[PDB]
Design a binder for this molecule. Structure first.
Ligand SMILES: *[C@@H]1O[C@H](CO)[C@@H](O)[C@H](O)[C@H]1NC(C)=O
Ligand SMILES: *[C@@H]1O[C@H](CO)[C@@H](O)[C@H](O)[C@H]1NC(C)=O
Ligand SMILES: [Ca+2]
Ligand SMILES: [Ca+2]
Lengths: 272, 99, 635, 635, 272, 99
């Protein structure tokens, strides 16, 4: 059981009116808890357990780190555009950074840059350098590696700070963050002369990880028979996923739906 | 590299006329985050609509979720039109009662 | 009492205050024309010094300086059109006004028309200015700047006038006054105080022009235009009468005989001692001298100073107001010659103000109109200025001043003609200036028509507008001395730093060519941001009740503005050391200005100068950050 | 615990401390020759950085600098006699030592003998130095000074040697090292830090000599003397071998090829956080690098630093000592090239030290003999030094150090070769240096013989003497951080001021001739005295228990040394701004030096320079007084 | 009954070894209470009522004022010598300054300089200037009057401070300062054929003011008959004075001695 | 202007052999304060001598008092020699038993 903390940043060039181009998202165990917006550059909470349990202190640290990253990435974005001779063009820069803590508490950190929707630079902590995902990224690669400071700082964050803030967020979460709700599975089905299609929906559950597979004659079919579960989101931290199966008009009842989920003791098998 | 959105219309709970449910439109995989979405009822844009926070996946592709509270009937038709730069005309996707 | 109570006490106090009476009282023949050093000046000084005593302030004292100004000689100055042999021909005017610190000389040559005299205007001019007299419009910039720009292009002499478009005055025979010293303070005691202890050594401000400069009426300008050719660019949006360059056959002869005159200046002060840390204080001031009646240029300001000093004396003695820090009220003289009184004070008591005076508020020209409310000040006072605009109401619109949420990114920096300029650029004291002004310059400034009659006739709701000004100044004062925290928002400097980085990417190519990097400067603004965050955090985790730990944090705050003064240049030769708002190669803009020359690959660009400029600006910033973060070992 | 208890704890701690072991440990092949930037240097740095961690100090960190020093090239440097008649060559020596920062060049001409190279020695010389090579004795002054004096007289090249009289060494073939940079710090980052952020712009210290300078053995000197005539003045009290000027037929050719070398320097720090005001602190340091073994020049100092850091860590962790202020322990490198490590720190962290670091104690060359105990420091530390001498006992005499009650009026000021010099002259941090020395210079300094073997053999009671040194440093530290009052006696500056007035009456005639008065300067030292009295009074009437009111008064004290730094010169071009102990025309001595020229009525004297010198020194003093007296309005 | 406070300063040029050339004496009602010495420039007390009754605070003020005056006068001494072209010469400068408070509390102040034992400059408070006692003093007179500051300061001291410190010293004295002891008068007489001389000594008294006159046949003789009383000091704050009278060998008993003193109720008349 | 001292020898209390009294020597009116004084007994300088603080009068003339504790006898002679610059040889003044 490993937990994770990671922030997402996204900015566009042409659009705006006053420097600082990024919006950010904070996720603890894939749970959006904070959002740094464009208009009225402020840090609003997401999810009730943070908009209450988070101390006034921690929130300050959070606000600053986000505004800081905004500024830091805004510079990087400008740097990268310029090393591409880009300017009168509209581009995008995206950054993802965070740490992942394992059961034994050991940590793994990451920091990635995405120029115009594609891998550009990946920070490598163990060697204090970056790996250019493409030729046009090498200029920036070098420009950052001469400095020497940047890398050491980025590592310090991933190795020391990030893990620390993840801890604070977990203790602060015990209750609503690990609060897992089981799915409401419902097998439906549309019929035609052509064939009969079966739809097995797993409703309003949490977290997102879940298993949905069809069972022919109460037996396990092959993954090749159906497409992978299609997880969708509801505007309320709950998800729903469904799997479809086309079967010979009439053999309906011959197929069942098996749904495994940590929010359930034993695997639930539904039949319409 | 630009990417066109993937529109998916559906309901929170299994459609059941008379029961106030929820109509979702979930665009994903598109790139230039700049995108507009509207939820239509019988061909009309619905107001009092809500949406989540724009975000993106590993491949830097953006995804956004729109949703409105609604009460389904067999008379009314629901669908969302998504306008992006990668599209000539605002691609529309109707809501398949089954999903 | 708490903010809300103070806010109200101040408010009511204001509602029953008559500014109109004071402004008008300051325009009686008793102090009509009050040129710095004149009896009328001294009279108004004594009046103010006495009002301070009446208000019963902790203490009221005065400073006395002997400075050198310039006045017009017994011989008239003149502008004459001459014939190729020096022959008399027209005699355009024997100007009533003059420009202090112009060079005493008489020159003649072709009269070319620059526009406003902006460095750019000369740049885009067609006719070369080299070797000839230039004529320009008042506005956009300082006379000293105009004259300095012309002189750098080898012009000789400068004639200044007010076109009817920018200055829609009826009387075209109207003359005006100004000074051309590219600096502040007594130009003969540059970088040090005008005190007898000094025995006034021979020292000449490098900001003194070496060519004559004269003021001429609009009428005169038009008469000169009657001997010039070439339609004035429509782009200039100016009178249909001007034209550039005189007819090859005709040329002008400017002659100015202005003479230096040593005078005695009086700075009247008043202080309201603080209740917790009296050793720290705010300074609020206004210019008292004026060339003519100076109603708007001097009266309103001084009126505001008197009232403010009164209201706060009451609040303290009656309403039981208890400012933790002190408040100084100062009435300076010789402002018309370049904030001389004020500069002499700063240079005189430098050691006493260092990290003690933490903010300056200027009241000069606070009321010139109604349409707008402009503001110029250190970024450290932006937040305070904002909050103040959100709770203060426009004297006419009735609406809140805060109407534009992007106002901060449109703030124009302090200029040489503003008394606040020296405080921020030289002293390192965050300063601020503001007004209820128009999009048009108050036409009568520096003229004989800047009288009460004109002031109220133009803005009839004077008393109400004056009150609004008094209210914003009043609130700044409360906010700055009221409680444990200084409302100085050092976070605002992160936006300025980022903006400098933006102004710099257009030169990333050049930087790359010189084999240099911008990464260290980049990491510097980074470290500053970190530092601001660390300090805001320290405040957060502090018990606002422990007056000791709070002293320590506020000390870090007071040092912020100071650490932006360049520690690598001479304060005597380059008084305006502030790398953001000063003047000189140590300046951040100057670094950009040099870099811009690298475009047209010709001499101009000084690379070694640049490599040094970069090294120092970079370190001045990392240093400011390393200090802001606290304790050397914790870096 | 109180002074007496601390005094004792420290004392016993010392009695059980083995300095001998440490000094000897610092001379093992592990760190034998430790030239700045060398591995052995870095090794000793890591050793110290680790000892700090072991001592468990609040925090231990390091600073890393990239500076440019100078080393000898692959080509040998040489001194050769070139025989005019038939260009026959002798070849006196291919010197083992060298002078860092000498100009790389090869010159030849007549060899004239100056003495020590003192500005006076050249003055009283008979043979003009113009155009020829000069030979001088080590001593009395710095190499840089010698070279700078010779160069100002148009000499070319300088040869330095140790005569047997001043330096009674057996081996006459012994060579030595030194540097000729007339300043401190990395001479290629003058007035700013040697940090990569700087991108090392092209900047050259104006203190860098423009002629070659070489070191020669005594033997070589005598060989050159065998080709010179004219008995060396008996007045010089030097070897019976020297003579001035070479035989008209013969002349010498000096050739040095030294090359610049960029290196990495490491400054290791350690701090013991204070218990009340940790933000204020004392700095104690010692040079780590050395050309040869550097036992006395580097070892003893570093040994002292290690021990002191240990004893105070215990006292704090065991004996429950609780210093109100912090203590920093620093081991610097590149000291042999002019207190480079230390200067780079001060220039790097300027903003962080300002009014925070309040005293510096240097430990370099603390033990060189037994006969005497000398001291050089800011007058602000005289009283502290006195009290300390009254209660500390001579390691051999057993008697108290305080033996002369006029010691203070015989204190010699800090010189360029002392690491304490930059702290006081540039930083404005009262500093001090002291030693158990002899009337003779420790002969082996800068040589290969400065080893432990020699050190203890010369002074066998080393451990005891080292202890005495450690005890005086220890006490300074206690006294400075121990309780509410800073033992900085600002009253001591009244005697310095009066003395300046005395140095000035011999020029009252000149002052009178220039139509100037000395009355304002006179009233200035008067006002300073008043100020000191007012401050001592304020302390008197204060409850030493109110840590707030006491903070305020101590702040006024910390600003005293700072206010003597000239606020009128550029710190970059003139780092040593202290008007009493710096260098440059802003200096008080410089004012006298100029005035002295007015005697021989010929050019030299620059009157306008003087009139300015006077105006500024006068005001720098009145200003220091007006600040010391507190609150502008209370002047 | 008027009280007085005054300090005396005295310095010599040639003699010394370290600037600051003055020693000083402090007197309250002509009672030496303090002494600033040459060797080990320190302020020692004189008389027990000060070396105990004087607060630690007041003593500090006193010490500083004395050290200050030392420095200030040392400068003046240098100035004055130089305006006389003196240097390789040994001269002396003496200064006396103080205030005199009348019964009605009104005060009179004074400040005088004595160059080489003669009047040189006398400070005149009411006109903020000095009066040169001789031509060679005029240079200094002018040099000080240009300054303007000096005079204002000196006046401030005499008008404000001096009076104030005299007050403190009086309250602090009530008891041992006004403690007056009466004289022990003793008429003796030396005889010879030539004539018989009568000596009337008034022993161990305090203060110093006293009246001693001879009485012939119990009647008042003329002041012309004898020399004025000769007041001498004893090393203990007590004085003694005597008056002599030569008389025809044999008429001894015809003369008596009358001694008036505040320490006595009615005038004492002694006979041998 | 220089001034020669005025030496005055006397006793604290009327001389009375056998009774320990006090021998004073009081120089006054001299100028150059620099002056030396010794109290003699039968022509010998006495040690354990005391003196007051040098001071001066309105006319800037200095005065100093020396005094020793002593027991008078008709055999012993007492006097003080004063050496000043205004004197060729150290002027001596013996103690007249009567005064
Ligand atoms: C100061 O100088 C001015 C002119 O330089 C003069 O008028 C004034 O009287 C002087 N004041 C003093 C105190 O010397
Ligand atoms: C700093 O600069 C020096 C000399 O320019 C260079 O040798 C060194 O590698 C640089 N260090 C870093 C961390 O950039
Ligand atoms: Ca000035
Ligand atoms: Ca440097």
């Amino acid at each position: 059981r490993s937990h994770s903390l990671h922030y997402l940043f996204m900015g566009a060039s042409e659009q705006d009116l006053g420097l600082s181009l990024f919006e950010a998202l904070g996720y603890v165990d894939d749970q959006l808890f904070v959002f740094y917006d464009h208009e009225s550059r402020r840090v609003e909470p997401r999810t009730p357990w943070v908009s209450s349990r988070i101390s006034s202190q921690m929130w300050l640290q959070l606000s600053q780190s986000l505004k800081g990253w905004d500024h830091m990435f805004t510079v990087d974005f400008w740097t990268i555009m310029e090393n591409h001779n880009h300017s009168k063009e509209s581009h995008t820069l995206q950054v993802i950074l965070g740490c992942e803590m394992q059961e034994d508490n050991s940590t793994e950190g990451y920091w990635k840059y995405g120029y115009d929707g594609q891998d550009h630079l990946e920070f490598c902590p163990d060697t204090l350098d970056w790996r250019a995902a493409e030729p046009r990224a090498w200029p920036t690669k070098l420009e950052w590696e001469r400095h020497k400071i940047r890398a050491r700082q980025n590592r310090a964050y991933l190795e020391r700070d990030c893990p620390a803030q993840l801890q604070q967020l977990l203790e602060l979460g015990r209750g609503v963050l690990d609060q897992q709700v089981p799915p409401l599975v419902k097998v439906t089905h549309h019929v035609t002369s052509s064939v009969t299609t079966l739809r097995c929906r797993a409703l309003n559950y949490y977290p997102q990880n879940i298993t949905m597979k069809w069972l022919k004659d109460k037996q396990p079919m092959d993954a090749k028979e159906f497409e992978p579960k299609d997880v969708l989101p509801n505007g309320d931290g709950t998800y729903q996923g469904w799997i479809t199966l086309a079967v010979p008009p009439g053999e309906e009842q011959r197929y069942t739906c098996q749904v495994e989920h940590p929010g359930l003791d034993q695997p639930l098998i539904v039949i319409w | 590299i630009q990417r066109t959105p993937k529109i998916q219309v559906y309901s929170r709970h299994p459609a059941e006329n008379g029961k106030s449910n929820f109509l979702n439109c979930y665009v994903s995989g598109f790139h230039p985050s700049d995108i507009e979405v509207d939820l239509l009822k019988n061909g009309e844009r619905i107001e009092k609509v809500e949406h989540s926070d724009l975000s993106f996946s590993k491949d830097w592709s953006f995804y956004l979720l729109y949703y409105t509270e609604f009460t389904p009937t067999e008379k009314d038709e629901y669908a969302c039109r998504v306008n992006h730069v990668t599209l000539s005309q605002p691609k529309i996707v109707k809501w398949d009662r089954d999903m | 009492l708490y903010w809300d109570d103070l806010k109200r006490k101040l408010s009511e106090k204001l509602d029953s205050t008559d500014f109109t009476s004071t402004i008008k009282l300051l325009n009686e023949n008793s102090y009509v024309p009050r040129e710095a050093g004149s009896q009328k000046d001294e009279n108004l000084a004594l009046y103010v010094e006495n009002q301070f005593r009446e208000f019963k302030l902790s203490k009221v004292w005065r400073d006395q300086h002997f400075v050198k100004i310039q006045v017009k000689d017994s011989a008239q100055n003149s502008v004459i059109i001459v014939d190729k042999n020096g022959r008399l021909v027209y005699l355009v005017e024997n100007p009533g006004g003059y420009v202090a610190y112009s060079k005493a000389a008489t020159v003649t040559g072709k009269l070319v028309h620059a526009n406003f005299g902006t460095k750019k205007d000369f740049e885009d001019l067609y006719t070369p200015v080299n070797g000839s007299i230039v004529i320009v419009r008042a506005g956009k910039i300082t006379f000293a700047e105009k004259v300095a720009n012309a002189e750098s292009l080898n012009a000789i002499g400068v004639l200044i006038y007010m076109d009817q478009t920018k200055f829609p005055i009826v009387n075209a025979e109207l003359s005006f006054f100004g000074h051309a010293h590219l600096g502040t303070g007594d130009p003969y005691t540059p970088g040090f105080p005008s005190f007898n202890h000094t025995q006034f050594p021979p020292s000449r401000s490098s900001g003194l022009p070496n060519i004559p400069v004269q003021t001429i009426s609009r009428a005169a300008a038009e008469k000169l235009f009657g001997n010039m050719e070439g339609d004035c660019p429509s782009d200039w949006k100016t009178d249909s009468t001007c034209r550039m360059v005189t007819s090859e056959s005709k040329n002008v002869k400017l002659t100015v005989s202005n003479v230096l005159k040593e005078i005695k200046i009086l700075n009247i002060f008043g202080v309201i001692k603080g209740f917790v840390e009296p050793d720290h204080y705010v300074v609020v001031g206004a210019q008292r001298d004026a060339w003519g009646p100076g109603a708007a240029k001097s009266g309103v300001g001084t009126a505001l100073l008197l009232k403010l000093a009164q209201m706060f004396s009451d609040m303290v003695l009656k309403d039981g107001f208890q400012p933790s820090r002190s408040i100084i009220f100062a009435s300076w003289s010789a402002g018309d010659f370049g904030s001389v009184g004020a500069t002499e004070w700063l240079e005189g008591y430098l050691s006493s103000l260092h990290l003690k005076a933490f903010t300056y508020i200027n009241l000069d020209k606070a009321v010139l109109g109604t349409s707008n409310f402009k503001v110029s000040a250190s970024p450290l006072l932006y937040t305070l200025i904002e909050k103040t605009m959100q709770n203060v109401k426009h004297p006419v619109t009735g609406q809140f001043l805060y109407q534009d949420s992007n106002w901060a990114s449109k703030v124009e920096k302090l200029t040489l003609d503003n008394a606040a300029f020296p405080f921020l650029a030289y002293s390192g004291i965050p300063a601020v200036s503001f007004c209820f002004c128009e999009d048009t310059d108050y036409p009568y400034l520096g003229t004989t028509m800047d009288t009460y009659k004109e002031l109220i006739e133009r803005i009839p709701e004077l008393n109400k507008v004056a009150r609004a000004a008094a209210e914003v100044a009043g609130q700044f004062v409360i906010k700055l001395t009221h409680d444990v925290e200084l409302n100085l928002d050092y976070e605002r400097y992160n936006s300025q730093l980022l903006s400098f980085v933006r102004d710099l990417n257009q030169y990333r190519a050049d930087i790359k060519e010189m084999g240099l990097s911008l990464q260290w400067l980049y990491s510097a603004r980074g470290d500053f941001f970190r530092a601001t965050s660390r300090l805001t955090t320290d405040f957060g985790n502090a018990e606002k009740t422990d007056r000791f730990v709070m002293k320590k944090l506020n000390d870090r705050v007071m040092r912020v503005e100071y650490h932006f003064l360049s520690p690598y240049v001479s304060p005597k030769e380059s008084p305006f050391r502030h790398v953001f708002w000063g003047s000189g190669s140590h300046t951040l803009p100057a670094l950009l200005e040099n870099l811009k020359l690298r475009k047209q690959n010709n001499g101009a660009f000084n690379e070694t100068l640049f490599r040094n400029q970069l090294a120092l600006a970079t370190w001045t910033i990392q240093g400011a950050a390393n200090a802001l973060s606290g304790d050397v070992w914790d870096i």
